[PDB]
Amino acid sequence: STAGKVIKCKAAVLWEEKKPFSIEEVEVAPPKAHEVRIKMVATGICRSDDHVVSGTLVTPLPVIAGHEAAGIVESIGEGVTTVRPGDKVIPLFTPQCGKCRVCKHPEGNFCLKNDLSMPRGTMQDGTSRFTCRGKPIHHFLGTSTFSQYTVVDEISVAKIDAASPLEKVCLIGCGFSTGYGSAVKVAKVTQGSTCAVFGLGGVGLSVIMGCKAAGAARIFGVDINKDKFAKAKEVGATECVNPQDYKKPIQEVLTEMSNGGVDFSFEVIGRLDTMVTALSCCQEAYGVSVIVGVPPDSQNLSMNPMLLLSGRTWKGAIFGGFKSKDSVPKLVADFMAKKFALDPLITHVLPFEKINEGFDLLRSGESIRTILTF
Amino acid sequence: STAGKVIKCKAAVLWEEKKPFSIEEVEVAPPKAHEVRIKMVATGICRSDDHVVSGTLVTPLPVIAGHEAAGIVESIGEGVTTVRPGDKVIPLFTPQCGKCRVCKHPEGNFCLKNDLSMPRGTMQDGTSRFTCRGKPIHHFLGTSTFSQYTVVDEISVAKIDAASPLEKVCLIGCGFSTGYGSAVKVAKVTQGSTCAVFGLGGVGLSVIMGCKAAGAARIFGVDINKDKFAKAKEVGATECVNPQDYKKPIQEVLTEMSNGGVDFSFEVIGRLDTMVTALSCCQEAYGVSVIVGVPPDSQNLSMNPMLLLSGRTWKGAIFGGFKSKDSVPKLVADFMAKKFALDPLITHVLPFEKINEGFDLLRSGESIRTILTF
Ligand SMILES: NC(=O)c1ccc[n+]([C@@H]2O[C@H](COP(=O)([O-])OP(=O)([O-])OC[C@H]3O[C@@H](n4cnc5c(N)[nH+]cnc54)[C@H](O)[C@@H]3O)[C@@H](O)[C@H]2O)c1
Ligand SMILES: NC(=O)c1ccc[n+]([C@@H]2O[C@H](COP(=O)([O-])OP(=O)([O-])OC[C@H]3O[C@@H](n4cnc5c(N)[nH+]cnc54)[C@H](O)[C@@H]3O)[C@@H](O)[C@H]2O)c1
Numbered sequence: 117s118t119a120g121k122v123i124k125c126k127a128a129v130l131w132e133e134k135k136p137f138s139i140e141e142v143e144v145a146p147p148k149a150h151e152v153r154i155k156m157v158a159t160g161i162c163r164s165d166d167h168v169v170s171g172t173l174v175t176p177l178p179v180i181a182g183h184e185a186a187g188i189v190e191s192i193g194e195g196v197t198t199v200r201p202g203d204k205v206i207p208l209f210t211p212q213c214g215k216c217r218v219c220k221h222p223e224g225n226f227c228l229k230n231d232l233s234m235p236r237g238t239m240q241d242g243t244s245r246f247t248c249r250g251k252p253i254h255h256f257l258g259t260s261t262f263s264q265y266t267v268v269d270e271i272s273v274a275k276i277d278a279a280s281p282l283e284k285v286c287l288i289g290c291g292f293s294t295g296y297g298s299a300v301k302v303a304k305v306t307q308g309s310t311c312a313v314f315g316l317g318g319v320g321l322s323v324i325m326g327c328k329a330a331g332a333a334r335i336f337g338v339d340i341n342k343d344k345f346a347k348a349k350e351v352g353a354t355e356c357v358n359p360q361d362y363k364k365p366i367q368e369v370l371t372e373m374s375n376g377g378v379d380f381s382f383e384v385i386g387r388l389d390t391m392v393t394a395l396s397c398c399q400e401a402y403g404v405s406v407i408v409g410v411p412p413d414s415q416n417l418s419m420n421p422m423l424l425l426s427g428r429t430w431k432g433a434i435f436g437g438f439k440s441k442d443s444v445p446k447l448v449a450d451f452m453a454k455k456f457a458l459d460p461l462i463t464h465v466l467p468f469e470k471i472n473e474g475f476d477l478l479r480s481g482e483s484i485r486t487i488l489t490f
Numbered sequence: 491s492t493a494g495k496v497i498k499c500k501a502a503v504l505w506e507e508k509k510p511f512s513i514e515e516v517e518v519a520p521p522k523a524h525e526v527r528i529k530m531v532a533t534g535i536c537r538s539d540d541h542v543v544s545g546t547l548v549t550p551l552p553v554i555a556g557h558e559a560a561g562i563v564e565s566i567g568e569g570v571t572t573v574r575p576g577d578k579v580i581p582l583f584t585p586q587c588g589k590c591r592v593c594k595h596p597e598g599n600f601c602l603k604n605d606l607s608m609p610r611g612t613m614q615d616g617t618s619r620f621t622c623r624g625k626p627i628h629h630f631l632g633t634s635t636f637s638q639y640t641v642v643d644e645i646s647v648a649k650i651d652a653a654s655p656l657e658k659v660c661l662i663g664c665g666f667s668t669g670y671g672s673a674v675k676v677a678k679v680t681q682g683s684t685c686a687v688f689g690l691g692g693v694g695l696s697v698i699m700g701c702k703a704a705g706a707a708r709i710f711g712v713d714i715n716k717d718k719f720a721k722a723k724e725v726g727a728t729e730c731v732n733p734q735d736y737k738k739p740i741q742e743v744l745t746e747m748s749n750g751g752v753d754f755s756f757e758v759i760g761r762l763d764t765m766v767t768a769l770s771c772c773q774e775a776y777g778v779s780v781i782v783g784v785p786p787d788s789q790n791l792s793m794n795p796m797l798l799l800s801g802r803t804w805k806g807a808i809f810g811g812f813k814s815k816d817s818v819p820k821l822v823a824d825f826m827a828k829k830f831a832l833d834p835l836i837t838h839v840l841p842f843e844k845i846n847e848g849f850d851l852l853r854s855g856e857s858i859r860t861i862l863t864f
């Protein structure tokens with residue numbers, strides 16, 4: 117009896133950069149063909165959502181952000197075959213259309229239907245399902261999870277285990293999967309190796325988790341906030357270092373600590389300088405460095421290509437290299453079987469209505485993940 | 491006998507940048523412990539040797555350059571076990587000590603004993619075996635092949651098949667092995683893939699050979715000198731393109747040609763701009779780009795890390811990723827077994843005394859490899 121009808125509900129609308137979200141009523145159109153309307157249950161605050169506020173990440177405004185979430189299907193449009201009303205689902209900010217050259221490639225996951233490279237802030241059909249104050253409001257990465265209801269394309273949603281705890285498994289929608297996959301799938305961390313992880317937020321902790329799962333012998337956590345070190349050790353960091361404590365640049369420090377460079381390094385911050393430092397600190401002949409952090413819009417880094425010529429490998433990835441729709445249900449199943457833990461990432465819980473407090477907690481350095489409940 | 495005695499012989503000395511080689515008499519000391527003195531038979535002219543002349547590469551002068559060569563052992567120092575007087579050998583400009591962390595690593599080949607990173611222009615012991623007009627002359631990459639006799643450390647020489655034609659297999663000492671290994675070992679080019687090769691000199695042609703050998707379906711040769719195209723097609727290029735023919739940047743052209751980007755790209759020139767263009771032209775989600783060219787000293791490139799975040803892999807390598815002492819004898823054996831051709835790389839064969847004329851041929855665009863015969 118809400119099926120086929122416009123739903124009025126509360127969402128967190130971002131009208132302008134560098135402003136608080138406005139929690140207010142929006143209108144959510146019913147799903148069109150191959151679309152799915154989802155009642156949100158839990159959503160995490162990822163630093164990439166903050167990047168939209170700060171203008172680090174440029175996407176059309178006004179917008180309903182949010183991309184790390186889980187909820188329950190309210191209704192499905194014509195021709196949907198992969199979810200049903202009442203199913204538990206995770207929106208996929210990286211789609212999996214299953215048809216494009218990337219989806220068909222054994223390794224690739226950055227599906228060509230993504231809204232990340234050149235954001236339009238729309239559904240796949242170039243239109244919006246959201247109205248607020250009578251004005252159209254942009255989507256974000258096809259997900260727009262900061263709303264009591266959202267509409268996503270079918271290629272941007274995965275059915276998950278019906279017994280899943282949504283307030284935990286929402287993290288599988290971005291931070292955990294990204295960090296863990298960056299280590300196990302993208303870098304392919306090896307048993308006995310030495311790893312360095314730059315940035316010990318939600319995603320960097322997940323990288324550490326993945327490095328420890330892959331059997332790394334030494335895992336160096338690097339952060340300018342020493343308050344982040346205790347938790348990093350808890351999830352597998354063997355040593356933590358704060359660049360501020362040292363006279364030498366940290367790439368030199370880490371090279372010394374690793375007797376000539378690390379096997380695998382990860383940038384999980386989003387700064388051009390730490391992307392280069394992270395590359396430099398991996399062993400010059402065989403080291404691998406993975407960029408996970410999101411850089412500031414349109415800015416280029418400068419580097420000496422001799423860092424590569426010696427034999428380093430440099431790569432980046434979205435969503436841990438996981439093919440999203442294939443991978444998310446499996447990751448949930450694995451979580452339900454206790455193959456990895458999510459609680460170490462969750463430091464704060466708040467109602468959706470306190471979204472701004474949640475962002476304050478992230479910006480202050482106090483939280484890892486705050487989970488918002490609808 | 492010459493063993494244990496200084497040899498007076500002819501070498502090509504480079505007294506200063508941007509001048510002709512001086513062909514004149516030098517004194518070559520006998521080998522010390524773990525050293526090998528080699529009578530040179532044939533040496534190729536590699537663009538890297540030109541970079542020493544041009545100042546693109548910085549290495550101490552005065553110098554005896556040359557690193558792509560083959561000869562016959564004249565004498566050995568105490569303690570040498572891997573070669574004997576009379577053996578055919580190839581000097582190894584990337585050593586293989588067998589003891590360092592890189593030599594012990596299954597993938598790495600940039601042995602920590604190399605003289606490339608921080609060139610000293612000496613023997614492993616920090617001294618020189620060469621004098622000319624009473625002045626010490628530096629070595630180059632532990633090899634110094636532009637001389638009738640050179641002295642190399644044992645870790646910088648490999649014994650090869652006694653029946654090898656030295657005037658051909660000298661190419662295994664640099665250009666062939668570098669290009670071929672860059673394709674087959676570093677990129678790990680796959681069957682049915684699309685490849686783009688920037689630069690169609692000796693090394694880029696060898697990259698093409700490797701891509702074809704690895705079963706690439708399409709191989710795009712890219713050069714501003716259209717005279718290089720015929721030979722590129724002979725060795726496997728399926729299409730050749732000259733960036734100067736197009737109004738659009740060539741990365742865009744190549745992306746269109748490859749219906750969204752290539753599987754593997756190779757920079758085989760040594761320009762910062764083409765390194766970035768080569769990266770960009772590989773498919774954004776799963777593409778791999780390998781830097782082979784040597785860039786001008788101390789210059790940084792500028793790039794947008796979003797090219798990596800989407801999923802690209804960027805890497806570089808020295809000597810095709812090959813562990814040099816293990817690999818060079820096997821490559822020579824494979825050549826003798828007709829597994830690959832070297833003649834397509836050889837455009838000119840000149841006596842050593844015409845070294846300058848050979849560099850002029852390279853610089854004018856007219857040659858691929860000139861082989862100099864002693
Ligand atoms: N590639 C992907 O798919 C993907 C997915 C998730 C998040 N991201 C990005 O990954 C980054 C981390 O996200 P997150 O974990 O939620 O963020 P976060 O919780 O802000 O963590 C970042 C950490 O970096 C630390 N830091 C800041 N500056 C420095 C410095 N100069 N040196 C060392 N440490 C420093 C900081 O103290 C904090 O603990 C952000 O840029 C995100 O946008 C990318
Ligand atoms: N990584 C290694 O171990 C290694 C080994 C051997 C050589 N190298 C380097 O690899 C590069 C190629 O060496 P080579 O094959 O002897 O040199 P080469 O024979 O001069 O070939 C270079 C080719 O690049 C072409 N070229 C120049 N500018 C451009 C441009 N803007 N766009 C397209 N094509 C262009 C040029 O026409 C020529 O055919 C040089 O920088 C060498 O120093 C590196």
Ligand SMILES: OCc1c(F)c(F)c(F)c(F)c1F
Binds near residue numbers: 162164209232290434
């Ligand atoms: O945190 C995941 C995430 C990314 F990795 C991006 F590259 C991006 F543009 C974005 F909006 C985002 F949410």
Ligand SMILES: OCc1c(F)c(F)c(F)c(F)c1F
Binds near residue numbers: 538547583809
């Ligand atoms: O051509 C091989 C070669 C290189 F790949 C270098 F990086 C270098 F510095 C050099 F001197 C050289 F000869």
Ligand SMILES: [Zn+2]
Binds near residue numbers: 211214215216229
């Ligand atoms: Zn797709």
Ligand SMILES: [Zn+2]
Binds near residue numbers: 290
């Ligand atoms: Zn995220």
Ligand SMILES: [Zn+2]
Binds near residue numbers: 587588591
């Ligand atoms: Zn070594």
Ligand SMILES: [Zn+2]
Binds near residue numbers: 538539558
């Ligand atoms: Zn060379």
